[PDB]
Structure 1
Amino acid sequence: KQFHLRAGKASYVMQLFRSGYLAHVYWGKAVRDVRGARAFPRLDRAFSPNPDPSDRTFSLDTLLQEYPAYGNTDFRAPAYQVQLENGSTVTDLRYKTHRIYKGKPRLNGLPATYVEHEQEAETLEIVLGDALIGLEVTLQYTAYEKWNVITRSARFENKGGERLKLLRALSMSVDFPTADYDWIHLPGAWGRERWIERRPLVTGVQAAESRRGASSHQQNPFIALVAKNADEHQGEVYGFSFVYSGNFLAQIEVDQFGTARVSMGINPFDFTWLLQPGESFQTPEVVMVYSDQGLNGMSQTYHELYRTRLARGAFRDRERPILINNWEATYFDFNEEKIVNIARTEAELGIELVVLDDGWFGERDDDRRSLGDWIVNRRKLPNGLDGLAKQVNELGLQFGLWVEPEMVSPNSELYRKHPDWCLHVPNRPRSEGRNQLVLDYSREDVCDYIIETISNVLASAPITYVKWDMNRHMTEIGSSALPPERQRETAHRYMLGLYRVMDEITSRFPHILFESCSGGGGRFDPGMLYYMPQTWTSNNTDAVSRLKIQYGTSLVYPISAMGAHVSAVPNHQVGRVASLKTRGHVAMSGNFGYELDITKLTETEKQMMKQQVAFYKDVRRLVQFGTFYRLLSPFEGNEAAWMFVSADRSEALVAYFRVLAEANAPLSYLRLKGLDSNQDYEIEGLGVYGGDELVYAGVALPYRSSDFISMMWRLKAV
C-alpha cells in the first residue's frame, strides 16, 4: 500500500503502516521504486510508548509521518491539534480512503499554484478519519509533471455532532530519516528584507515565524534544508515556501534519534479555529521543491512555477512597464502642475508609466491623516484624477495610483463615522503604527465598503497601474462581529477577507497592473503574488544595500515580481553615494524603474537615464523572463554577481559588482553558468569567447578603483 508521486525529476513516497497509519518513506531524486521501504530495523525504543500492546516495536514517537498528532505516543511537535468539548486533546487519524486525478484543485478562499491543463499535474488526496469524534482530514498532494514541485495542504472537516476547536492547523509536516543538514531562512527588517542566513541544525527546535498578521520584513515564509556541502551550483536542497500572507510558523525539530521534522503553516500562536458540526477548514498550501543542482536549481524551479503558474492576470507573461514614482522625489509636497510639467521630460527619456504615490487624497499632507477617505484632494489636483490621468496619457504615458485600503486614520471622516470598523478589543487603548489603524477585514460590511469605494476610484480615471500598500502590523487583534469563542480566528479571517477583496477588485479591472507593497517588501510572499503579479522589493533603494536584498529575494521569487528603482544620492535610507551607472545596473537586475526628482538632474544624468531606459528595453524580456543564475554572494564577500540566460541559451546578460575598493588589489575573474559549452558567445565589446571557456575558465575582469563599481556584459551566440 505505497503512494508514489512523480514531481518532475523527483520522487515523493509514502506508505500505509499497520492499522491505517500514514508513514513517510522518501523525498528526493526520482527513483523507480522504493523497495526497502519496510526493510528497516524495528526497535522497541525506551520511553517511546505503544498504542498497540501486541507490538512494542511500534510507536508514533519513532514513525516517520505525514501529519502527526501529539497525545497518543508521539512526543514530537504535532502538525495539528484539536481540543474536544471534554477538554482533552487526543485525536487519532487513521486511513479512511484516497483518490487520484489529473490536474490541481482550487483551494477555498485562498491563493494556490494552479494548472492550465490537467496534464500539467497529478493530485493525490488521502482522506484520514477519527471515528470517535467524526473528524476528517484530507491531505492534498500535487505533483507537477514539468517541475520538481510537490504542493501540500490539508482540509479539516467536522462530520460528527460535537464542536471541535482547532488549536493548531499546519499545512504540512514531513519526517526526514536523518538530520545531517544546514537550514536556510530569510530574516530581515524594514529597509533590509530577506538576508540569507545559513545555520547548522540543532537537536531541538529551530523556527522562523511571524506574529504580525503579515508575512513580515522580519522573517519571510521560506525555509530550506540543504546538504552540508551544497552551494549555489550543486548539492541537494529541499525548499519550503508558504503560499500565505499572514501569520506563519516554519519549524524544524530534530529529535533524539536524529530525525528532522519540518513543518509549516499558519502560526499556532494566538490562533484557534472553531469547527461546528458540518464546518470545514482549508489550510494554505506549502510548495516543496527538491533540487540536486544546488540553490540555483531550487530557485529556478520556484521562478518558473511562480511566474507562470501562481501569478495571474493579463500581465502574467507581459513585459513590465518602466515607471517613474514620485515618492522619494516630492513625498507629500506635490501638485498636479509639477507632475504634468515634468511628464513631457519623462516621456522623452523613454519612461512608459507615471505613478502618483501617497498624498493625493483627503487632507493627506503628512502621514498622520486621511487614510480611509479616498476622495481626491481638489486643492492638490484641481482637475482631479481624471484630469491628471488624461493629461499624462496625452503625452504617451500610462497613469498609476497608490492606495492603502486596509488602513484607516483616527483623524479621518471614515473613522469618525465608523470607529468600530477597526481591529480592536473591548476597553483597550488602540495602539497605532504610523498614526494609523487597521480595518477589520473579517467583517463583510467593511470588505463590501472597500470593494465599492476603491472600484469607484479606479473607474473614475484611465488608471492602468495600482500600488496597493500596507504600512502597519496588527495589534489588539479582535473583532466586534465575532463571538468570544471565535475571537482568536480574527487574524486569519482578516487575511481571508483581504484575499476576497483583492480577488474581486483585480477581476473588475483586468486592464490594470497591480503591484503589491508593504512598506517595502513586508509582504513579499507567494500568496500576494497570486493576486498581484509584482511587488515593491524594499524601501531601501540604495544600490549597494539592494545587492543583499535582491540576491536574497531571488532565492524564492521570480525577477519579474522584484521591483527595483533608481533613486537619488546621497541615498535617503543610508546616505550612501553611488554613481548613477551602478544604481542603474542594480535596478536593471530587477523590475526596472525610477524614483527621483528629474528637475534636480543635470543634462548628463538625464542623458544617462535615456540610455539606461533604452538598454533595459533591449534586455527586458531576458531579465524578467529569462533564467536566473547567482554567481557571487554579497553575504559571503565583497562582491555580488549574477546573470540571465534565455531558454535556448543563445542570449545572456551578466552583471558584476564590487563594493569596497582595495589598493593594489589582486586580479579578479568571473566564471559563468548556464551557457552552452559547444557554442561561442560574442561578449559585447570584448570579443568572441567559447561557452566552455566562460564557464570553466572564466573571464578576466578589468582593474578598477573607487567604491561601488558595476559592469554589465551582453552575450550573444555566434
Structure 2
Amino acid sequence: MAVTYNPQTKQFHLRAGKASYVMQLFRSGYLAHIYWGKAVRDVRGSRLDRAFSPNPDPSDRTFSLDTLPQEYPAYGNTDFRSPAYQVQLENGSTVTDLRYKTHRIYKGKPRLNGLPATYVEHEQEAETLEIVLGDALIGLEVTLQYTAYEKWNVITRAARFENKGGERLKLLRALSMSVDFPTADYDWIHLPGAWGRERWIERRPLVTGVQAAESRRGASSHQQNPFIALVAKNADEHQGEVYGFSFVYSGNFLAQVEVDQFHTARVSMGINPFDFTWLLQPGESFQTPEVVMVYSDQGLNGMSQTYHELYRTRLARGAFRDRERPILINNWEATYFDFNEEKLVNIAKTEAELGIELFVLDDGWFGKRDDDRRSLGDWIVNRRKLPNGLDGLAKQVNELGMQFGLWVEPEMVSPNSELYRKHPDWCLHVPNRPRSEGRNQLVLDYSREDVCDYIIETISNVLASAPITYVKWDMNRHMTEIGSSALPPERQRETAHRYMLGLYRVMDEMTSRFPHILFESCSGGGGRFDPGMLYYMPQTWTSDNTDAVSRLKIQYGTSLVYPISAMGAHVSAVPNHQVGRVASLKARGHVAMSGNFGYELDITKLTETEKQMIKQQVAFYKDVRRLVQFGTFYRLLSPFEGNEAAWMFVSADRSEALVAYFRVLAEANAPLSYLRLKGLDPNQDYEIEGLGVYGGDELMYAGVALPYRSGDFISMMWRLKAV
C-alpha cells in the first residue's frame, strides 16, 4: 500500500504486502525499472554503454534505451527490444519519445473506464501512483497507473493514452505493462490447453529470444490462458521466488518474455497487438486493461493463495461474492433437447430429495432451438415446450425447495433466426466475404450499441419473467472475419476490442439488473476463464471435460490463478464422453468436490445405491463447502509431474482441513506412498476421520502413510479437525 517518491533519489518505492517494486527517474526524464522482489527498506538505483546500442543523447554516450531497464519502452529511438507500445503518426513515422512530466500519489484504487479491474472497499486497502509521460512534439500523453495493495503482495498496472495534440495518432500496440528484469535466470510457466483440456501447467527454461502465449480468437481462449509467471530455477509449490502476471481481460492477449543479448528478461502483457489498432483523434483517450502482478518467495502456493484471496474478495463482485455457492444439477443429458414441462417437476422432486439445491434448465427452451443449429438470437420462450412459460416451471421447482436456473448464449445468432433475417448486418463480418460458422452460428457485433441494447432488452425480458436465481452465460465459438459495418475503415481493427467492451457493458448491466441471480460464465467450458470475466460473473464452468482423471490436470492448473470458489466441477455419468473412461462414483465425487460442486447427469438413470451415494456426497459437500470454497488451498502433488495429484483446504484459523489424494495406474506390489501436508499448526493435534489422531507437525514433516491400495484410479478424501 505504502507508495512513496523520494525527490532526492527520484525513486518511486511501491510497498505491496511483503514485496517492494521500485522505479527511478533517469537523466532527461526516462523512467527506469529498478527492483521487484521481497520488501526492502531501500535499494539504490552499470555498463549501459554497449557496442551497437546507440545513444539517444549525442551529448551523453553513457547509455542507450537498448540497455536501460524500463517500465514502458518504445522502439525506434535506440531501444531494439520488444516495445510496450507503438504509435504511427500521420507522416507515417512510428517514432515516439515519451518522457516523464509529473506524477501523483493517492489512496485507494481507481476504476478503469469501460473495464473490469481489481478494486478496494476502503481507501486504506491500497495506494495508487500515476506517472504522467509525454511526447511534447506530438502531444501524446501516457499515464502509467500503478496500485500497491496493503495486505497482499500485489502490484497492478495499466496505461492510459491521450492525444493532446492536433493530429491523428494510431496506436499499433498498447500493452498494459512491461518490466525489465536484470537477469533471465528463471523458468517461465504458462497455461496452454485446448477444449476439454484447459490450463495444463507448462514450465520451460527461457530462451535468448522471445517466448509467448497469446490468443487471436477474440476470447482469452482454451488454447492459452492469459497468465504467465517467471519462477526461480529451484522454486516449487512450497518455496522459492515466483512472479505472476495475470491479465484482467477476456479478449485477445499477448503475454511475452523477451530475453536480450545481455540476458535481461523483458516481460510484457496486454491486448494482442496482432490485428489490432486504435485510432485516437485529438482529445481522445485509450485505457488498457490491467495486469495483476504477484510476488512470492513461498513458491507457487504462495502466489496462488494471493491471487485466490485478491480475486475472490476484490475482483469478483455482487451478492454472492462471499457466499457459499449452490450445489446444482444441470438437466441437459436427461433430455439433450427432448423436453416438456411434465418430466421436469418430478425430476426436481427426486433431485430435491437428494439434497441438491439448484435446478438448471439447459439449451433449447427458446424459439426453434433444437440442435446446435437454430434460433440463437431469438430469446423468447418457445411456448410449445413450456406453455406455462418459465414462471410455472420455476415456481413449482421453488415449492420443491430448489432454486431455478437457466442457460443463455446471447453473443450468438443463427443464420436461420428472425434476428438474422431482420438485421443481417448485426453480425461480425467484413464486406463481400463468406461468413464462416462455428457450430452453425455467427457472432453478434457487440461493438454496436444497437446490438447491445437489443440483447440487454431481450435477455432482461426473459430473466424478469420468472423467479430465476442462476444463469449460465455460454459462448460457443471464436471470432472470424472480424469487422463491423458500423465502424469506418480506419477503425476496423478496433472491432475485437470494442466487441469486448460491448460485452462488458452488457454483462455489467445484466448483473446489476438482476442482483438475485448468481451468474456463471461459460465458453465451451473454460474458454474464457480469466479475471476479466470473474469481475462480472463470480464463477465459471471450468471445462466441458468432466472425466475424473482429466479434471485432475485441469483443476490443478486452473487453481494456479483462480479461486476454488469460481471453479465449477461437476459429477457426470460414465462412459465418459470426451475421453472414454470409467472411474467410481466415489472418485468423480472426490475430484468434483474439490471445486465448486455440482452435477451433470440424468437422474432418471440412477440406481438406488447410486442416488444413495449422491445423497451422501451432497451431505458431505455441504459439510465442507465453506472450507473448499473459502479456505486456503494448497497444492501438494502435481499430476504434471507424475501419476499422483494431491491438494488440501485449510480453514482460516487452521482448526479444520480437507485433504484429497489421487493416483492413476497404481502398479501391483507397489512401494508404500506418503503424503506430507501443509498449512497446519504444528503444535496442534488433529483428528483425521478414519485414521486417528496426528500432530500437525507429524502430518507436515513426516506425512501420512497412505492406506496401501492398487488399481486404475485411487481416490481418497479426509476431513481433519483440531482435537
Same fold (TM over 0.5): yes
Q: How many Å apart are 1:461 and its aligned residue? A: 0.5
Which residue of the other structure, out of 381, 391, 409, is the alignment partner of 2:414? 409
> Is the contact made by 1:328 and 1:567 (CA closer than 8 Å) also made in structure 2?
no
> Is the contact made by 2:409 and 2:474 (CA closer than 8 Å) also made in structure 1?
yes
Q: How many Å apart are 1:35 and its aligned residue? A: 2.6
Deviations for 1:280-332, whole angstroms, at most 9, x for unmatched residues?
00000000000000000000000000000000000000000000002233221
CA distance in 1, matches of 2:318, 2:242: 31
Aligned to 1:699: 704
> Is the contact made by 2:407 and 2:472 (CA closer than 8 Å) also made in structure 1?
yes
> Is the contact made by 1:25 and 1:37 (CA closer than 8 Å) also made in structure 2?
no
CA distance in 1, matches of 2:593, 2:46: 49
CA distance in 2, matches of 1:22, 1:44: 17
- Tell me the secondary structure at the aligned position of residue 82 of structure 1: strand
Runs of at least 5 residues in structure 2 that lack an aligned partner in the other structure: 1-9
Identity of aligned residues (%): 97
CA distance in 1, matches of 2:528, 2:341: 31
CA distance in 1, matches of 2:393, 2:39: 57
CA root-mean-square deviation: 0.9
Aligned to 2:20: 11
CA distance in 2, matches of 1:139, 1:352: 46
> Is the contact made by 2:49 and 2:67 (CA closer than 8 Å) also made in structure 1?
no
Deviations for 1:458-480, whole angstroms, at most 9, x for unmatched residues?
00000000000000000000000
Runs of at least 5 residues in structure 1 that lack an aligned partner in the other structure: none
CA distance in 2, matches of 1:634, 1:383: 49
Q: How many Å apart are 1:696 and its aligned residue? A: 0.2
Aligned to 2:45: 36
CA distance in 2, matches of 1:168, 1:489: 12
- Tell me the secondary structure at the aligned position of residue 604 of structure 2: helix
Q: How many Å apart are 1:57 and its aligned residue? A: 1.7
CA distance in 2, matches of 1:592, 1:399: 16
- Tell me the secondary structure at the aligned position of residue 402 of structure 1: strand
> Is the contact made by 2:216 and 2:272 (CA closer than 8 Å) also made in structure 1?
yes
> Is the contact made by 2:220 and 2:249 (CA closer than 8 Å) also made in structure 1?
yes
> Is the contact made by 2:178 and 2:268 (CA closer than 8 Å) also made in structure 1?
yes
> Is the contact made by 2:570 and 2:599 (CA closer than 8 Å) also made in structure 1?
yes
Aligned to 2:104: 99
Q: How many Å apart are 1:541 and its aligned residue? A: 0.5
Matches within 5 A, 1:276-291: 276-291=281-296
Deviations for 1:176-212, whole angstroms, at most 9, x for unmatched residues?
0000010000000000000000000000000000000
Report how many aligned residue pairs link the two structures: 714
Q: How many Å apart are 1:55 and its aligned residue? A: 1.8
Q: How many Å apart are 1:337 and its aligned residue? A: 1.6
Aligned to 2:569: 564
- Tell me the secondary structure at the aligned position of residue 708 of structure 1: strand
User: Which range is displaced more, 50-59 or 345-354?
Assistant: 50-59
User: Which range is displaced more, 302-311 or 569-578?
Assistant: 569-578
CA distance in 2, matches of 1:121, 1:418: 47
User: Which range is displaced more, 653-662 or 29-38?
Assistant: 29-38
TM-score in terms of structure 2 length = 0.98
Deviations for 1:633-680, whole angstroms, at most 9, x for unmatched residues?
011101110000011100000000011120111101110000010111
- Tell me the secondary structure at the aligned position of residue 397 of structure 2: helix
User: Which range is displaced more, 498-507 or 383-392?
Assistant: 383-392
CA distance in 1, matches of 2:178, 2:336: 46
CA distance in 1, matches of 2:252, 2:710: 46
Q: How many Å apart are 1:711 and its aligned residue? A: 0.6
CA distance in 1, matches of 2:56, 2:711: 69
Q: How many Å apart are 1:449 and its aligned residue? A: 0.4
Aligned to 1:264: 269
CA distance in 1, matches of 2:59, 2:419: 67
Q: How many Å apart are 1:382 and its aligned residue? A: 2.1
Aligned to 1:429: 434
CA distance in 2, matches of 1:553, 1:674: 20
CA distance in 1, matches of 2:448, 2:97: 35
Deviations for 1:505-527, whole angstroms, at most 9, x for unmatched residues?
11011110000000000000000
Q: How many Å apart are 1:147 and its aligned residue? A: 0.1
CA distance in 2, matches of 1:570, 1:656: 23
- Tell me the secondary structure at the aligned position of residue 22 of structure 2: strand
Q: How many Å apart are 1:334 and its aligned residue? A: 2.2
Deviations for 1:132-158, whole angstroms, at most 9, x for unmatched residues?
000000000000000000000000000
CA distance in 2, matches of 1:336, 1:360: 11
> Is the contact made by 2:238 and 2:298 (CA closer than 8 Å) also made in structure 1?
yes
CA distance in 2, matches of 1:486, 1:160: 19
Deviations for 1:52-86, whole angstroms, at most 9, x for unmatched residues?
11221210000000000000000001000000000
CA distance in 1, matches of 2:440, 2:145: 42
Aligned to 1:484: 489
Q: How many Å apart are 1:336 and its aligned residue? A: 1.7
TM-score in terms of structure 1 length = 0.99
> Is the contact made by 2:24 and 2:45 (CA closer than 8 Å) also made in structure 1?
no
- Tell me the secondary structure at the aligned position of residue 548 of structure 1: helix
CA distance in 2, matches of 1:541, 1:340: 26
CA distance in 2, matches of 1:160, 1:378: 58
Q: How many Å apart are 1:44 and its aligned residue? A: 2.2
User: Which range is displaced more, 370-379 or 94-103?
Assistant: 370-379
CA distance in 2, matches of 1:692, 1:331: 51
Deviations for 1:486-533, whole angstroms, at most 9, x for unmatched residues?
000000000000000000111011110000000000000000000000
C-alpha distance 152-36 of structure 1, shift in aligned 2 (>3 A): closer
> Is the contact made by 2:141 and 2:163 (CA closer than 8 Å) also made in structure 1?
yes
Q: How many Å apart are 1:375 and its aligned residue? A: 1.1
User: Which range is displaced more, 89-98 or 48-57?
Assistant: 48-57
CA distance in 2, matches of 1:335, 1:59: 71
User: Which range is displaced more, 1-10 or 48-57?
Assistant: 48-57
CA distance in 2, matches of 1:377, 1:452: 18
C-alpha distance 15-36 of structure 1, shift in aligned 2 (>3 A): closer
> Is the contact made by 1:626 and 1:646 (CA closer than 8 Å) also made in structure 2?
yes
Deviations for 1:247-289, whole angstroms, at most 9, x for unmatched residues?
0000000000010000000000000000000000000000000
Matches within 5 A, 1:544-693: 544-693=549-698
Residue 27 (str. 1) matches residue 50 (str. 2) = no
- Tell me the secondary structure at the aligned position of residue 660 of structure 1: strand
- Tell me the secondary structure at the aligned position of residue 529 of structure 2: coil
- Tell me the secondary structure at the aligned position of residue 544 of structure 1: helix
Aligned to 2:136: 131
Matches within 5 A, 1:524-535: 524-535=529-540
CA distance in 2, matches of 1:574, 1:354: 27
C-alpha distance 23-157 of structure 1, shift in aligned 2 (>3 A): same
Deviations for 1:358-386, whole angstroms, at most 9, x for unmatched residues?
11111111010010011112222121111
CA distance in 2, matches of 1:478, 1:60: 37
Q: How many Å apart are 1:705 and its aligned residue? A: 2.5
CA distance in 2, matches of 1:281, 1:289: 25
User: Which range is displaced more, 24-33 or 677-686?
Assistant: 677-686
CA distance in 2, matches of 1:586, 1:329: 22
CA distance in 1, matches of 2:45, 2:111: 35
User: Which range is displaced more, 52-61 or 544-553?
Assistant: 52-61
Q: How many Å apart are 1:706 and its aligned residue? A: 2.2
CA distance in 1, matches of 2:468, 2:290: 33
CA distance in 2, matches of 1:424, 1:452: 23
Q: How many Å apart are 1:36 and its aligned residue? A: 5.1
- Tell me the secondary structure at the aligned position of residue 263 of structure 1: strand
CA distance in 2, matches of 1:324, 1:35: 58
> Is the contact made by 2:334 and 2:604 (CA closer than 8 Å) also made in structure 1?
no
Q: How many Å apart are 1:37 and its aligned residue? A: 9.8
> Is the contact made by 1:477 and 1:490 (CA closer than 8 Å) also made in structure 2?
yes
Q: How many Å apart are 1:574 and its aligned residue? A: 1.1
Deviations for 1:399-436, whole angstroms, at most 9, x for unmatched residues?
00000001100011111111110000010000000000
> Is the contact made by 1:241 and 1:286 (CA closer than 8 Å) also made in structure 2?
yes
Residue 520 (str. 1) matches residue 525 (str. 2) = yes
